[PDB]
UniProtKB/Swiss-Prot annotation, chains A, B:
This is Serine palmitoyltransferase 2. One of its GO terms (cellular component) is endoplasmic reticulum membrane. The gene is SPTLC2. Changing I452F: In HSAN1C; partial loss of normal activity as measured by reduced formation of sphinganine; affects enzymatic affinity resulting in the accumulation of the alternative metabolite 1-deoxy-sphinganine. Induction: Expression at protein level is highly increased in brains of patients with Alzheimer disease. No changes are observed at mRNA level. The chain crosses the membrane at residues 15-35. It is found in: Endoplasmic reticulum membrane. It comes from Homo sapiens. It is an enzyme of class 2 (transferase).
From Swiss-Prot, chain C:
Component of the serine palmitoyltransferase multisubunit enzyme (SPT) that catalyzes the initial and rate-limiting step in sphingolipid biosynthesis by condensing L-serine and activated acyl-CoA (most commonly palmitoyl-CoA) to form long-chain bases. The SPT complex is also composed of SPTLC2 or SPTLC3 and SPTSSA or SPTSSB. Within this complex, the heterodimer with SPTLC2 or SPTLC3 forms the catalytic core. The composition of the serine palmitoyltransferase (SPT) complex determines the substrate preference. The lineage of its organism: Eukaryota, Metazoa, Chordata, Craniata, Vertebrata. One of its GO terms (molecular function) is pyridoxal phosphate binding. Changing G378A: Does not affect catalytic activity towards serine; does not affect the interaction with SPTLC2. It comes from Homo sapiens (Human). Changing F328A: Strongly decreased catalytic activity with L-serine and palmitoyl-CoA as substrates. Induction: Expression at protein level is highly increased in brains of patients with Alzheimer disease. No changes are observed at mRNA level. The transmembrane domain is involved in the interaction with ORMDL3. InterPro entries: Aminotransferase_I/II_large, AON_synthase_class-II, PyrdxlP-dep_Trfase, PyrdxlP-dep_Trfase_major, PyrdxlP-dep_Trfase_small. The gene is SPTLC1. It is linked to Amyotrophic lateral sclerosis 27, juvenile: A form of amyotrophic lateral sclerosis, a neurodegenerative disorder affecting upper motor neurons in the brain and lower motor neurons in the brain stem and spinal cord, resulting in fatal paralysis. Sensory abnormalities are absent. The pathologic hallmarks of the disease include pallor of the corticospinal tract due to loss of motor neurons, presence of ubiquitin-positive inclusions within surviving motor neurons, and deposition of pathologic aggregates. Residues 1-57 are annotated as: Interaction with SPTLC2. Belongs to the class-II pyridoxal-phosphate-dependent aminotransferase family. This is Serine palmitoyltransferase 1. Changing C124Y: In HSAN1A; reduced canonical activity towards serine; does not affect the interaction with SPTLC2.
Amino acid sequence: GLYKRPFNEAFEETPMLVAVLTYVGYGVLTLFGYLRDFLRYWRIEKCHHATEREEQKDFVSLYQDFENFYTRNLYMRIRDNWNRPICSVPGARVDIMERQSHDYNWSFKYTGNIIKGVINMGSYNYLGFARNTGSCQEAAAKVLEEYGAGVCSTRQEIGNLDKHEELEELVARFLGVEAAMAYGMGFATNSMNIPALVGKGCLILSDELNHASLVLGARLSGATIRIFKHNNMQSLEKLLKDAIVYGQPRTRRPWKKILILVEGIYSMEGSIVRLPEVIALKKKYKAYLYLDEAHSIGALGPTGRGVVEYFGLDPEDVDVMMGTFTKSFGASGGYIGGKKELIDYLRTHSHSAVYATSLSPPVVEQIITSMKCIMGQDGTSLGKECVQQLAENTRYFRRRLKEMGFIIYGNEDSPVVPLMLYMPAKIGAFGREMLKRNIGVVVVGFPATPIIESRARFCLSAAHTKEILDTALKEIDEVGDLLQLKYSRHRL
Amino acid sequence: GLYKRPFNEAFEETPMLVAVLTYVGYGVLTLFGYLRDFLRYWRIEKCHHATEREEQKDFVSLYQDFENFYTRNLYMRIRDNWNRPICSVPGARVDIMERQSHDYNWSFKYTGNIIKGVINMGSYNYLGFARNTGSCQEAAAKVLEEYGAGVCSTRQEIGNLDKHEELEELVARFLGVEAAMAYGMGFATNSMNIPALVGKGCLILSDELNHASLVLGARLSGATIRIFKHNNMQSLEKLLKDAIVYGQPRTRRPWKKILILVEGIYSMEGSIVRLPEVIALKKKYKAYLYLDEAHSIGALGPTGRGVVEYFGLDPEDVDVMMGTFTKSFGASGGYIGGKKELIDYLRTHSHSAVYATSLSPPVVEQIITSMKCIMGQDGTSLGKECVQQLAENTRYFRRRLKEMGFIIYGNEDSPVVPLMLYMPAKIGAFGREMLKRNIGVVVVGFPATPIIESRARFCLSAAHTKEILDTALKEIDEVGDLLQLKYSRHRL
Amino acid sequence: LVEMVQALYEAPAYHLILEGILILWIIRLLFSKTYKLQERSDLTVKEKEELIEEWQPEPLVPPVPKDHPALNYNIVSGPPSHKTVVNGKECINFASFNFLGLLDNPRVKAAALASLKKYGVGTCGPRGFYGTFDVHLDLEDRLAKFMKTEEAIIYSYGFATIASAIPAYSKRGDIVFVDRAACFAIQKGLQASRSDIKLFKHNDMADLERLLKEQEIEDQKNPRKARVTRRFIVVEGLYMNTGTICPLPELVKLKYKYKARIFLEESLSFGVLGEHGRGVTEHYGINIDDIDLISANMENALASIGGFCCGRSFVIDHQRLSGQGYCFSASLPPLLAAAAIEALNIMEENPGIFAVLKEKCGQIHKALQGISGLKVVGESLSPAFHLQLEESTGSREQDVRLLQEIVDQCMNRSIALTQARYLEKEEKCLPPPSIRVVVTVEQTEEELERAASTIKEVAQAVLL
């Protein structure tokens, strides 16, 4: 595998003192959670939770209490960060309805005040197509008027529609593959198409940081699942060699198939997959590749064709190309692209093709309009402008954050910036301080991430301008000084 | 496997006290051997051995001394039993040149007188074809006068003759197989035709008591060799099952082939192979069979057709049939019989076919004449009386020996009769006392056999009259009284 | 630290032994390299039977093409001799290894007939069990006297001679420096023993010196192992595949310089080289005692089945108890031994026949030189030499077919020739296809000139 352009990524290790203090904080939280559970058990303190009805007291308890431990003690203390209701279009500036709690986050009451002009770093738009007014909205309005919102049947039955065929051919031209199919949910795409490809007796080599949809799809199929380390091509080689030479585990018969599930951009880590190495290993060991391009289909690439354009590889090398329209194009949906035989087999044997409702007509219209805008069928210079602006914003933001003294993960091209906080209290502190200064961010804690590594993620966009980035950087600098988040050894 | 006739064999276990006394004797011999080695080490006693030349004292010593331990300390003491020169045709009566030693068997010198009329129980002439005056000798002399003695080229080159083709046709008719091939050595048959059939990646299931030629042939080829217990059908079945199921050891792949090496009559033990069981398992598990018929090709069967005639089986069942003319037909040689494709492949791809000289011309004429005599093509009733006479001699000798109180191994229909002595000193004692009474026998000691089992083998013949058998039995009984060799609990 | 020692000495014994066993437990855990899962799975009986029924074995013999040349055997309608009859056509024998022409000597036939009347055809047993005749001892003594050595041992088959002599002395872990172009018998002998085989270039003492020096360096690495490792040099006096003699004096000097014994194969040179026909040692004048073991067979020059090995008693007496082809096989028939003894007597009587063979080999080697499409491979002193293709095609099959076409054309012209045969898959260094030419004291000068002219014209016609 050869890299035409340099491939740079930095994952700085945690300072040891910060690790020790992290463990001190988690131990304190655990002890006080145990004490609170003891008090709640003997009814010494009133419990603010619902209970099973009287006529069902004899039934076995529906839940196990110990499973909800981290929900009651850690999550509930900082619940106010998440599930923030917005009441406007999720553009560069979003309006958040203010809510306040007087019983420590157990219940929320909506204050009449409405925060306005909040810089939006949590929304997933990458080319800024989530606009209230535009050509896409007008086309979607026309299609909604003449068609109606939502179709009431399945694709195999009468529910199939001409707009869906138009969208499928447009996607096939966009990717560069022979054919493609469209689904009404990316989660549904993975969970409902992975079981069709592989069955009992096949192997699935899954990455260590894969999305929940891919894991669920692999689990629904009967294939054996082996997990390799994140972007360690040595580990991928080792598992591939062992699988080929050893055969099936109990009776050493040969595997029927080998399928490798990888992603374009990993959202939380921020890293980009080493595609050339994976393709080389696939060709050498005769495996199949399933590439998930939910994040990179619009963000990456000089023209925005995905990771395959970014690295320069041929799109016909990857066996299956999954993708999602939610992130970049601004409409919910999903798709799978590949050769015509694969697409015919999917149209024949696919769970969502047979049992689930197809896409809504206004959504497919807006996707068609956005994709034509990106390709350049409108004739406007737009589409290329969005990609250039997104790349410039990514480079500028990452450079400024790294030179300030913070710790940043991932590749330098990815528009996802996972700042590191490393401590449980600093999660809630950073979330509240950012919201107080009119910036919205997304923080992640322990049950999700490894214990030492807790992060706050910024999703850049082409809607953000230089003034907005300057303001956000100034506020981030002030708060990072306030909470002492500058753990970086090299720069500070 | 169905036995159309009763299958009787008795391998009585050794008396306990006899085993204890055997170990006492071997311990004494070992200790005195160590003492002798120490005495010779310091040159206190002059050694009667050859030493390396003075120019080569710097060279690393050619032999390791410990390997020759049992040669110097045990074999030399009773060396006079073996390597007994003879000066007559090895008929029922053979003439042995007499030798004496005054250096305790380190060096031998020949006295003038020769012992005459020694009853011969060591030679292999089962059907009594070793006669210097007979029709076969006339034919051999006639061919020797014309063709000359010896051919000076390989079969593939000008060394091929018409006599060899005639012999091959005769052998093919005799056995009943489609085709056969003839080689100039019985040892060479195995050693140079087993590697051709089976190569690396195959399995060779070998019996526990195979000849050295079969073991060497298996070792020369790269096949994996497993050993099953002697005529233990359970062990053979277990190894076949495990080999088919678990595959190759390092990489669990199916075996290319499975070959089973067995013999007709085992010489030293005296047992006859359980052919119907072996054939049934071979058919059941789709293996191949190699049957060594050196001892059973002339001795066994109503017409001396082999062991397959004795058991009534079909010759087409056994894949490869090796045989030797040395034992029964009275001329040195070997052969392999089977289907035509086997014989063509062996004629093309056999080591002795390409690199070694073919048979002598007088020897093939002697084989042809003897085999025609056994067939009945001569028309004389001679050659059919020989089989009846050998059967009667075997029955009489085995029954009379068993009713004296001796221990005898093997089947009731096997001409080779092992008589057990069980002690090291009794080996030399039996040999010397038998020669003193004008009977020649073959005594076998420890390193050849198990430690407790030291024996003396009698090879009966159709040349033995009843008077010779009675004289031998009377002398054997007297020596058994002298040495106390009757260790049978059932009879005495 | 002294106070700690005093307190420990004041401690009871059970406490200290418990702490010791705890330390042993700690060591065991720290050295528990293997990691276990406690996962055990056993196959179901139905699956085992399915595997049993599924497996299908390969056929015993692979399907053979009908175009293989070796499948067609030449049928000789009579004794193989001068003026033989091959394939029903009368021909002059230029293909059988009968140098001295003792196959048809009436004295040999008379001796064989007398011994046949005295003893019979078969010996009926190994040398240990009543298979030793007085003729065998007489022949062994005759060989020992003829070769000027202390002792000799006779085998009943030529291949087995060396294929069983080599493994007896060489064991696992030793070093053998064997020539590259050595016959198949030596190759199988070296495969039977498990020692490490080092191959050097054909008649290159530079490569032998280089390999010996490398082994000397490896010995300097580890003296203890080098104390118990033996080194042998296996060479052939007159090579079968190439037809070239070997340089003994350099080999002997390298032996005495690097402490490695020499095993000599003298199948072709036993009765053709030297003033009295004692082999390559007499031809070079090297002392007989320098070479440890000298092997040969009685089939080429002596015209009888068998083989032998000769040397000092120190090396020979081991083969009687360690040689497989000797311990576990029947002895040589008496008539063949008597024929060998009579042939030895004839050889010892008049030693000018070696000179006659030398001059005839010289004549034929000189005459053959000049073929456009064939090159002579060998030496002027060799009785058997090769004719190889000067310009080799891409594939071996076409080379073999051209050589066979030439051989058939020569056979129709009253000259009987054979082509050298090999196992293609097995041979280590596989020689190029060649036509084998053998010279005999029976063939006169005029027949040699006529044979040269015939092969010359046939080669010119076929190659053009």
